[PDB]
Amino acid sequence: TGIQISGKGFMPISIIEGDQHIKVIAWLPGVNKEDIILNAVGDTLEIRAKRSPLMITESERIIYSEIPEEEEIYRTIKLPATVKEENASAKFENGVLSVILPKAESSIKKGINIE
Amino acid sequence: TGIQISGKGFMPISIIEGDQHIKVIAWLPGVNKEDIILNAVGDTLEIRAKRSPLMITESERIIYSEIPEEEEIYRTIKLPATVKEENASAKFENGVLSVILPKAESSIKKGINIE
Amino acid sequence: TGIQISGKGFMPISIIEGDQHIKVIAWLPGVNKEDIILNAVGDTLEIRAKRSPLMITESERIIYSEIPEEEEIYRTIKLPATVKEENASAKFENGVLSVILPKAESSIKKGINIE
Amino acid sequence: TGIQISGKGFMPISIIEGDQHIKVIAWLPGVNKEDIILNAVGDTLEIRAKRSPLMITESERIIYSEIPEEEEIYRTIKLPATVKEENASAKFENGVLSVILPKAESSIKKGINIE
Amino acid sequence: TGIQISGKGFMPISIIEGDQHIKVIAWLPGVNKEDIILNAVGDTLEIRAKRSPLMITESERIIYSEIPEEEEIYRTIKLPATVKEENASAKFENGVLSVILPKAESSIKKGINIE
Amino acid sequence: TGIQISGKGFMPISIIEGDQHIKVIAWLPGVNKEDIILNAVGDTLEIRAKRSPLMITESERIIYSEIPEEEEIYRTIKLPATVKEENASAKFENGVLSVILPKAESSIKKGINIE
Amino acid sequence: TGIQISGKGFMPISIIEGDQHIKVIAWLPGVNKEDIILNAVGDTLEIRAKRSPLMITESERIIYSEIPEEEEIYRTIKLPATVKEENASAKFENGVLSVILPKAESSIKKGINIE
Amino acid sequence: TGIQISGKGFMPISIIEGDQHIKVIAWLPGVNKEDIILNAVGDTLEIRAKRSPLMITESERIIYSEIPEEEEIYRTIKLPATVKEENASAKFENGVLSVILPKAESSIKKGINIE
Amino acid sequence: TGIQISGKGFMPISIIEGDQHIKVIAWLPGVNKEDIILNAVGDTLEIRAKRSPLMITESERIIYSEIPEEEEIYRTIKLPATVKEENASAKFENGVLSVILPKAESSIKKGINIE
Amino acid sequence: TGIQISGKGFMPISIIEGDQHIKVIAWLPGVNKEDIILNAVGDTLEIRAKRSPLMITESERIIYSEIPEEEEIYRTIKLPATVKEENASAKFENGVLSVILPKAESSIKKGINIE
Amino acid sequence: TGIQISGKGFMPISIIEGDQHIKVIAWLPGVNKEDIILNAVGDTLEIRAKRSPLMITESERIIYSEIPEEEEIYRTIKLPATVKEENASAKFENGVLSVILPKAESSIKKGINIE
Amino acid sequence: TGIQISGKGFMPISIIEGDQHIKVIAWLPGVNKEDIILNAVGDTLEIRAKRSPLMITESERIIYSEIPEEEEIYRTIKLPATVKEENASAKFENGVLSVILPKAESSIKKGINIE
Amino acid sequence: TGIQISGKGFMPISIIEGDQHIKVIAWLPGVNKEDIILNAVGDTLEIRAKRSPLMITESERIIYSEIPEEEEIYRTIKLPATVKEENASAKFENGVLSVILPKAESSIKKGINIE
Amino acid sequence: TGIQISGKGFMPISIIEGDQHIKVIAWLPGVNKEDIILNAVGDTLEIRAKRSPLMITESERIIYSEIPEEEEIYRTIKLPATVKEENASAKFENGVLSVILPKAESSIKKGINIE
Amino acid sequence: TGIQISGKGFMPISIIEGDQHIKVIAWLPGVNKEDIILNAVGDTLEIRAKRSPLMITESERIIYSEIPEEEEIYRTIKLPATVKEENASAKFENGVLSVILPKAESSIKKGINIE
Amino acid sequence: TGIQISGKGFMPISIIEGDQHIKVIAWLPGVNKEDIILNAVGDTLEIRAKRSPLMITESERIIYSEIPEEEEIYRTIKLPATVKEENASAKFENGVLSVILPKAESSIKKGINIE
Amino acid sequence: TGIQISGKGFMPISIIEGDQHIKVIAWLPGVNKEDIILNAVGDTLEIRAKRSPLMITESERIIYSEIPEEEEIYRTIKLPATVKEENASAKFENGVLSVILPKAESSIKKGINIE
């Protein structure tokens, strides 16, 4: 049942499990597609990215703000199954990274019939 | 000094104030550019948008999730100055809406010299 | 000693350990034998099922109820030994699923003599 | 409005009220159809049954368990209406007993019109 | 399910329910068989008795005591079924009164079969 | 002033002290005269008895009960004076055992006059 | 070091220990010299007395009172040495009983020299 | 009655209200006259300035300090009356800025006579 | 390590320690250069000054204020080294007094080499 | 009723009382039969022993341990009856010492009959 | 660093780790050498045994006891290294079981030199 | 196991128990050898002494003090064995009284062999 | 994400993770380079060392100390990746041990591209 | 007014101040005159001594003890006046060290007359 | 008895006091011998040093760390005696600085004899 | 800044500090001018006096009292400057002692000019 | 028994009652004999006085003070007896006013004899 999330910075994760794969959704609003580093192996995925901070002309002042300032953020995740890093896909749109990880064959649960 | 935020759903705001305008940044990760409705007048801006929920094949199950499910979200904001809705600009990239509101002339603080 | 239960919905589990196998008992009252999905591999078993809700004619009203309404329920379990999914058996009677999982050879503790 | 449940052992009840009858649902997972004793009269129903305990070979040990051990369990219920014990029906499938109790004529609320 | 005990003085009760009767056991240690008053009707039984207090010669003093002094004690009990006061029996031995109350016909639950 | 009570089971004691003896009253409701074992020596008395439990036909069920179930009960008591076990008397009626213990000569307080 | 006081009613005690005796002072205000019963043996002294209550003509009412009403009062005391009841003296004046108890020979501590 | 202060950094304010004007005093110790920016309009005044930090030769170390380090500080204030930014005066001496704001004509309360 | 501050009134201090001297910074906003009294000797410095209060025409009222009213304020400080009062310098600008105190020769720590 | 245990070190005791003797069981796991010292007299028994500590090669380290380290342990017990030290027996097997102490004749409670 | 103990009953464990093996000490006082079952595999050892309860003639009564009554007890342990079940040794003396488990080659940490 | 200390004043005790005697150590700093009174009998020892208070010339004042002022101090001790007062020894040096009390023959525990 | 530290004694750890290796920093002030034992295998590293205690001539006394006295200290660490013990390097300077552990090939996360 | 006590071990101090000297009393029961080390200088006195521990034959056991075991004890005291170490006297009797310290001339307060 | 420590950063100190000197031990792990500044005078010593921070290639990330980051650290200590800065020695090895400070003659306590 | 008051009894102090002296006021109501002892030296003043207690004829009783009874009272004060005991003056009128202490030359703070 | 004190300012009172008069003591330290106003009538006395405040040259500052500043103080007291204001006396010395009030004849308790 094991899933271990860990890292720094704001990054709402979501783990979807299918029969033959695992989907991982992450919220990286403000982060630039090319600032994201994605790599995984075995049963752990690591998402690390950097989102630059709000640039303000000397004239402006931040009257108010709920957006976290930290620039470097990431998460290493322990998936509940080993996967094929080799066939992983990933899309990043509207600040949302979505990673598809095919389940490794050795981690594909096989059925049991009832009678 | 008045700034009144209010509405429903997750939407980290940020208000930047310059001498002749007001910048408003909002985090709408996952929201579709054309699902955003932006309108303002006087001293209040309203950002309302809808982000569709994570679609999962019947086969998948959400093993874990930190992403809020609510679909319809918005915020009406009371800015600390009246603005020219007419000349407002807005960009939406990487899940981040950024609105530029020119300060109305009547709300432009004028200087006072010290001696 | 590790055993990790996890999932959603009401489903009292029971894990029995023998020398060469592991028995797992689950309470799925109201669930339909063919609505149960059983599969396992390595050291983890997954029981997922759906029990339809109490259907009431428009005329009736639920005057009182201790029965949980949720329809989709499941549990993935981490057994304390690897098993042969291939030879697992399972019976479902009187709302009680009982799964027999033969211990994998590599997980069969071997004796040590005292003198 | 009176409904009085009472007895011993785990047995999630559910009382459905219709215009001319009362349905009572009980969760008796693991209990054997012929170990259930059902009888009622006036405005009270009594469900008493016994579910045998998990039998384990001397070799096995209960590594973990959420299933209550008590064998003899029951509930006497006070229904919100008198009923015809004589015409009561009952089905027991998938650990779920469902009893239909026709409302006694003297307990059938009659309508009142508004104008 | 209703059973209402009430009265004054120490008198441990016990209510046993059979299919066609109700047994009631009461602890009246020190009480004299002929100081007991037993009467009942409908669904309520009343046991009232008086136990004289420990008589001590002027010479003696009660060095210590866990025995309640109150002399007049009783309990009126609401049984879970109407009974035939007419056929009630009662035995009193070793400070223990035991009353047998035949269930009234109108209170005898009738069976319901399952299929 | 020493009096030490100790043992198991419900047994309200009462110790009466006279000039030349000690009376001990015990509540053994439900206990059978011949199931009581009484013996003492020096300054300690021991009362041990067994009261059989309420026998119920398979048909009956204990709907409610304030009577303790434990069968074997007893108490060893340290009296405030040595006594003549040899001349102790004892009566048991209506669930009440009453023991008379003649004070030993060596424990008979002798008077002191005031002037 | 043992001294055990016990009894009922208000009776401030005081124990004085000498080398060859033990003095006991008791406050029995309002008690009548001839209502006092004094006796002791071995290592325990017993003081029991009765002070009659304030008699008031029907005309009077107790507007206020700090004097305890209880009539029968006493105390049995465990002295730190065995004594010769036989040679005990006692004086009672101004509501104060004072008892002199010669230490028994077997309880007279004997000296040990230091060097 | 409205007065809204808001901003960042240490800056004790004081608002004095006259019949035809409003005085505002601010403590900007350590701040340089030409580092102060003063501007206002309508009913809000904004004071923003920057005080450089204590410069210490590499040789020195701050053994102790109650002086806040923040460099950029400011406050935007909502005055209880609209004012003529145009005729505002301001003096800055001994770390104290004092601003005189003539009340706008439309905000000059007019008298009411009592009889 | 000793540094003892003490006195009355608001006066944020700051003590900087160099190898051959001690710098002391104090916030005296609103205080007049010539109202400051500075003197020191041995290892203690004393700063005492008076700042006049905000003068308000009878017409004005203090609508709000965070500026402390007390007029006479001061602090006597125990420096962590004896100093040469004789060569102390002092500057007072923008409400900030800064005192330079040459360390006394006898208080100049001398080096120790490590090998 | 008196039983006084006291001493140091871990040593679960158990006192069994028969009519003519007293059994005392003690848990001395790891203690060597010949390291046990047993002696008693009157109404008190004393069990004192020493268990050597776990010897570990310099190479090993105690990764974890629930076994108390103390070496010298013992208990002096006050039995509820005087005994014949002279006829006491004792067996020590599997780390369990079991002592049989014949009750002294003077401590054998004699019977009292009830009628 | 992982070590997982788990099971039922009183059984103080101790785990000693050497470079090439693991020692496990267990306190099974009162347990019979031939009632102990020892087996292990991979990185987990299981110790299960049964100690019969104190047998008492009908005449005796357990006046006092700190010895746990449970008969069947055991523990499955997760060792911090895989081991060779095949070469495990075990001695049981004075209620103390001591098991020697040779570390598996694949679990023997290899050195790293510092410079 | 009984040991009862009691008395007044500061006097740290220490009781050592041998096979044939009992040693008692007491801290009587400042007390004068000839101000100590030692006597005992049976199973109780009594140590009473008086230490004069610090004498100060009128000129001096007690600037500070942790030494208790009370002059008369003592303790009566209940030893865990009867002793021969007759053969007791005692040494008093450096404010430390040490008493040797030979155990009485009747209190000398006799051995019990194990097999 | 798993990292498990464990051991005894003061030893501030620091784990740095690179793409192809893992660095581990440990503070072993006062420890002697040749008193350090470093070994690792799989995914766990073990650092064990001994620092001798401050030697003080009989003449000296430790007036004050924040340095922990314990001599033998160590930590076994679970790294987040398997490593090649074989190619580990290590430097120890200024009380700081620094270990470089090359990541095992099987633990080297591989990239995933986004589009 | 300064007096600073500090050190380890039990040692009740007492400081008496006269016009021309300072007396210091210390309780060193059990300490040997020649195990005491006394030295002082300026305004601080240091008392350090060692009292050997109670020696017990292997046969004896410490049944009870209020005497602190620590062997090495001491206190360094800061006197409220500088003194002439040179003329200090000291007596040690009955476990009580008493030191007389002549006040240094420079610390002898001189009088002031009132009128 | 005075010892005053003060400064910033992690630096476990230890002060050893001899008859003619004072030893000071400090833990400066990671600090470079030539980055340490040592100087003292009178009765105060000052240790100030700087330890550079862990340098990490852009590729690495600090997965975990118990090592404080602050670079500049120091402590000024008030020794309990004046010393000869001139003859102070100092060694720095294995992150441990050890300073020897000869006591000043004027601070060398001189003896006092007891009689 | 140091001022240390200390002593016993009620004596409200007041310390006034001038540029060249220190005034000390003390409330000694009821104390007799010739019962006051005043002396000081260096930086500490000592005021000690005795006020006799209210003398009452045997006939009178103190119905109520807020006046402290203690007779001997005093305070030793640490002044913030050394003084010339030699030139101290003192007046005592209306229960108020007032002492004038000329500051010692070495304690006279010297000025520092600001520019 | 009535005595009512009331007023403002610090003024410790004391009421002494004799058979024929009442003495009242008041602490008015610092108050001037001629600033005291004393008058009474019936059963109430009133003491009102004013003590001027400590006058300090501009040069001095109150470094510390426990003396209350309030100038005007007083107390009106309700005596437990009516008195002859006419014959009252009063002395004021050393800050202590002492008033003698002759009891009025009507308030002089007269005796009652006991028999």
Angstrom distance (rounded) from CA N58 to CA J37? 13
Q: I15 is written with which tokens?
A: 């003590």
Q: Is-contact Q51 Q11, C-beta < 8 A?
A: no
- Max Cα–Cα distance, chain E, nearest Å: 75
Q: Is F82:F96 a contact under the CB 8 Å cutoff?
A: no
Tell if the CB–CB gap between K16 and J63 is shorter than 8 Å.
Answer: yes
Q: Is N109 helix (H, G, I), strand (E, B) or coil?
A: coil
Q: What are phi and psi of N85, to 5 degrees?
A: -45, -40
Nearest CA in chain M to A90: M114
* Three-state SS letters, P4-38: EEEEECCCCEEEEECCCEEEEEEECCCCCHHHEEE
**What ranges do the domains of chain A cover?**
1-115
Quick one: closest CA in L to N51, which residue? L94
The pairing of beta strand N36-41 with beta strand O110-111: antiparallel
Local structure of residue H114 (DSSP, 8 states): -
* DSSP class per residue in L18-54: -SSEEEEEEE-TT--GGGEEEEEETTEEEEEEE-PPP
Indicate the residue of N38, N41, N90 with minimum beta-carbon distance to O107: N41
Q: How far is E106 from chain D (nearest CA, A)?
A: 8
Contact between residue C90 and residue A113 where contact means Cβ atoms under 8 Å apart: yes
Strand partners, I6: I76
Strand ordering across the sheet containing M36-41: K110-111, M36-41, M44-50, M72-78, M4-8
One-letter amino acid for residue M8 of the chain: K
Among candidate residues I30, I11, I13, the one with its CA nearest the CA of residue I99: I13
Contacts with L107 (C-beta within 8 Å, 6 or more apart), sequence order: J41, J42, L43, L81, L82, L83
In the beta sheet, which residues pair with residue L99?
L24, L90
Tell me how far the alpha carbon of residue B81 is from its chain's centroid: 16
Positive or negative: CA dihedral F4, F8, F12, F13: negative
DSSP I33: G
Report the gap between the CA of L103 and the closest CA in chain G (Å).
15
Taking contacts as CB-CB distances below 8 angstroms, the residues of chain B near H42 are 106-107
Matching residue, tokens 């003649």: F102
Q: How many CB pairs under 8 A join A and M?
A: 52
N55, β-bridge pairs: none
Helix, strand, coil tally for chain J in percent (to 5) = 10, 50, 40
Of H47, H38, H50, whose CA–CA distance to H88 is shortest? H38
Q: Which amino acid is at L97?
A: L
Say how far apart CA G9 and CA G69 lie, in whole Å.
Answer: 9
Return the closest-CA partner of residue G114 out of N29, L14, L74, L96: L96
Quote the CA–CA distance of L74 and L79 in Å, as a whole number. Answer: 16
b/e burial code for range D42-63 (CB count within 10 A of at least 16 → b): bbbbbbbbbbeebeeeeebbbb
Rounded to a whole number of angstroms, the distance from the CA of N71 to the nearest CA of chain P is 35
To the question of domain J1-115 being in CATH 3.90.1150.10, the answer is no
Backbone φ/ψ region at C55: left (φ over 0), alpha (ψ -120 to 50), beta: beta
G112: distance to nearest CA of chain L, Å?
5
CA K69 to chain centre: 19
Q: Which of P89, D13, B62, J78 is nearest to A13 (CA)?
A: B62
| Distance of residue P14 Cα from the nearest chain Q Cα, in angstroms | 4
N24: closest CA among N109, N100, N105, N104? N100
Name the 3-class secondary structure at L107.
helix
Phi, psi of E32 (to 5 degrees): -90, 125
CA distances (Å), origin E94, targets E26, E68, F38, K48, O8:
11, 18, 17, 49, 83
Whether the CB-CB separation of F45 and F56 falls below 8 Å is answered with no
Rounded to 5°, the CA angle G70-G72-G73 comes to 95
Instruction: Determine how many CB atoms are found less than 10 A away from the CB of residue Q69.
Output: 9
The 3-state DSSP class for residue G106 equals helix
Question: Helix, strand, or coil here: C58?
Answer: coil
Strand partners of residue I14: H65, I25
| A52 Cβ neighbours under 8 A, 6+ residues apart | A30, A32, A35, A71
Tokens linked to C75: 């549990």
The residue to which tokens 């000197």 are assigned: O21
Contact by Cβ (8 Å): H78, B1: yes
DSSP string, E27-82: E-TT--GGGEEEEEETTEEEEEEE-PPPP--TT-EEEEE-S----EEEEEEE-SS-
Question: Backbone phi, then psi, for G12, in 5-degree steps?
Answer: -50, 115
**Residue numbers in K near M46 (CB within 8 A):** 109
- CA triple K29-K33-K34, angle to 5 deg: 135
Choose the closest CB to H90 out of B2, B80, B114. B114
Chain breaks in chain Q (C to N over 2.5 A) after: none
Whole-number Cα distances in Å, C16 to C26, C45, C87, C92: 11, 14, 17, 17
Beta sheet of D13-17, edge-to-edge order: C61-65, D13-17, D21-27, D96-102, D89-93
Residue with tokens 């080993």: A82
Task: Using CA atoms of F9, F10, F12, F17 in order, give the dihedral in degrees to the nearest 10.
Answer: -10
- CA-CA-CA-CA torsion sign (I29, I31, I32, I35): negative
Taking an 8 Å cut-off on Cβ atoms, the answer to whether M107 and A77 are in contact is: no
Q: M92 in helix, strand or coil? A: strand
E48 strand-pairing partners: E37, E74
Q: CB P1 to CB I78 under 8 A?
A: yes
Q: DSSP of K73-112, one letter per residue?
A: EEEEEE-SS-B-GGG-EEEEETTEEEEEEEBPGGG--EE-
Residue I63 backbone class (left: φ over 0; alpha: ψ -120 to 50; beta: rest):
alpha
Q: How many CA atoms lie within 13 A of O40 on its CB side?
A: 33
Rg of the Cα atoms in chain H: 18
- CB neighbour list of residue A82: distance below 8 Å, 6 or more residues apart: A42, A43, A103, A104, A106, A107
Element housing L17 (H / E): strand L13-17
CA distance linking residue N100 with residue E63, whole number of Å? 63
The Cα E53–Cα E65 span in angstroms is 12
At N84, is the secondary structure helix, strand, or coil? coil
Cα separation values, K3 from K97, K109, O26, Å: 19, 17, 37
User: Would you say the C-alpha torsion C69, C74, C78, C84 has a positive or negative sign?
Assistant: positive
Asked if O62 and M29 come within 8 Å (Cβ–Cβ), the reply is no
Q: DSSP states of J20-71 as a string?
A: SEEEEEEE-TT--GGGEEEEEETTEEEEEEE-PPPP--TT-EEEEE-S----
Residues in H touching I96 (Cβ below 8 Å): 29-30, 95
If you measure CA to CA, which chain F residue comes closest to J108?
F41
Query: Do the Cβ atoms of J24 and J102 come closer than 8 Å?
Result: no
Sheet holding H44-50, edge to edge: B110-111, H36-41, H44-50, H72-78, H4-8
Q: Measuring CA to CA, which residue among B22, B10, B20 is closest to residue B80?
A: B22
The count of other CB atoms within 10 Å of the CB of residue J34 is 9
For J52, the token pair is 């050597």
At what resolution in Å was this solved? 2.9
What gap in Å lies between CA A25 and CA N1, rounded to an integer?
A: 71
For chain A, what is the largest distance between any 2 Cα atoms, rounded to a whole number of angstroms? 75
Q: Are Q71 and Q49 in contact (CB under 8 A)?
A: no
Question: Which secondary structure element, helix H or strand E, spans residue P64, and what is its range?
Answer: strand P61-65
Tokens for K70? 């449970």
Residues of P in contact with N15 (CB under 8 A): none
Task: For Cα atoms O54, O58, O62, give the angle at the middle one, nearest 5 degrees.
Answer: 50
Q: How far apart are CA N31 and CA Q34, in angstroms?
A: 65
Chain O residues whose CB is inside 8 A of the M99 CB are none
Is I84 in contact with I101 (CB distance < 8 Å)?
Answer: yes
Give M63's contacts in chain O (Cβ within 8 Å): 3, 15-17, 22, 80
C-alpha L35/C-alpha O46 separation (Å) is 56
Beta-bridged to residue F37, according to DSSP, are: F48
Top residue of I15, I22, I112 to mutate, by most chain O CBs within 10 Å, is I112
Q: Which strand ranges, in their side-by-side order, compose the sheet holding C36-41?
A: A110-111, C36-41, C44-50, C72-78, C4-8
User: Rounded distance, CA B84 to CA B98, Å?
Assistant: 16
Q: Which chains touch P (3 or more CB pairs under 8 A)?
A: I, N, Q
Residue A49 identity (one-letter amino acid): A
Decide if K41 and C1 are in contact by the 8 Å CB cutoff.
Answer: no
Do the Cβ atoms of I101 and I79 come closer than 8 Å? yes
- The residue with tokens 């196998």 is C21
Distance of CA A82 to the CA centre of its chain: 16
Question: What phi and psi, each to the nearest 5 degrees, are found at residue A92?
Answer: -135, 105
For chain M, how far is it from start to end, CA to CA, in angstroms?
27
Q: What does the alpha-carbon distance between residue L71 and residue G70 come to, in Å, rounded to a whole number?
A: 42
Q: Which of L56, K64, M92 is nearest to N15 (CA)?
A: L56
Residues on H contacting B at a C-beta cutoff of 8 Å: 4-6, 33, 36-42, 44-46, 76-78, 85-86, 88-92, 97, 99
Interface contact flag, P41 N108, Cβ < 8 Å: yes
> Angle CA(E23)–CA(E29)–CA(E31) in degrees, nearest 5?
95
Which two three-digit tokens encode residue H21?
A: 């004007």
**N-terminal to C-terminal alpha carbon distance within chain E:** 27
For N48, the 3-state DSSP assignment is: strand
Name residue, tokens 């008045």. B2
O105 three-class SS: helix
Could you tell me which residues come within 8 angstroms of residue P35 by beta carbon, excluding any fewer than 6 positions away? P49, P50, P51, P52
How far apart, in Å, do the first and last CA atoms of chain D sit?
Answer: 27
Residues C11, C71 contacting (CB under 8 angstroms): no
> From residue I76, how far is each of I41, I47, M93, Q63 by CA, in Å?
11, 6, 47, 10
CA gap B96, B12 in Å, rounded:
10
For chain H, which chains pass the contact test of at least 3 CB pairs under 8 Å? B, I
Dihedral sign, Cα of residue A38, residue A39, residue A43, residue A47: negative
CA gap Q31, Q53 in Å, rounded: 10
- Residue Q70 burial (CB count, 10 A): 11
Task: Identify the sign of the CA torsion K1, K7, K10, K11.
Answer: negative
Give the one of L12, L19, L62 whose C-beta lies nearest to N14's C-beta.
Answer: L62
User: F99–J110: do the CB atoms touch at under 8 Å?
Assistant: no
Closest-CA residue of chain A to C39 = A111
Cα–Cα separations (whole angstroms), residue L36 to C72, G112, L95, L98: 87, 10, 11, 12
For residues O80 and O17, is the Cβ–Cβ distance under 8 A? yes
Q: Which structure tokens are listed for C107?
A: 């997980």
Beta strand G72-78 with G89-93: parallel, antiparallel or unpaired? unpaired
Give the separation between CA Q48 and CA Q51, rounded to whole angstroms: 10
Which element (helix H / strand E) includes F101?
strand F96-102
Distance CA N78, CA N76 (A): 7
Hey, of N33, N66, N77, N93, which one would you mutate to test binding to chain L, going by the most L CBs within 10 A of its CB?
Answer: N66
Q: Measured between alpha carbons, how far is E24 from E15 in angstroms, rounded to an integer?
A: 5
Option in E2, E108, E112 nearest D90 (CB): E112
Name the interface residues of C facing D (CB cutoff 8 Å): 3, 12-19, 22-23, 25, 27-33, 54, 56-57, 59-67, 80, 94-96
**Pick from F57, F67, F95: CB nearest E94:** F95
O30 contact partners, CB below 8 Å, separation of at least 6: M27, M94, M95, M96, O51, O52, O67, O95
Integer Cα distance of K60 and I59 in angstroms: 102
